[PDB]
Design a protein around this ligand. Sequence first.
Ligand code: D3H
Ligand code: ZN
Ligand code: ZN
Length: 57
Amino acid sequence: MSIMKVYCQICRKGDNEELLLLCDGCDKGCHTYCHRPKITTIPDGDWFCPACIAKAS
Ligand SMILES: NCC(=O)Nc1ccc(N)cc1
Ligand SMILES: [Zn+2]
Ligand SMILES: [Zn+2]
């Protein structure tokens, strides 16, 4: 067995799933409202977290 429950890297809670961005690079989560700067566009498709982009850049 293996269990994955997603938690937001910042506040460390899995609530508000609708505002919880799962990064498709590294599978990590972050609430839009926990982000600095805050996200006000709930992404239309795929999310790459800030850390992943600076690697991919
Ligand atoms: N991995 C992309 C992602 O997380 N997209 C997403 C889309 C809609 C909502 N409400 C939340 C998250
Ligand atoms: Zn959070
Ligand atoms: Zn990532």
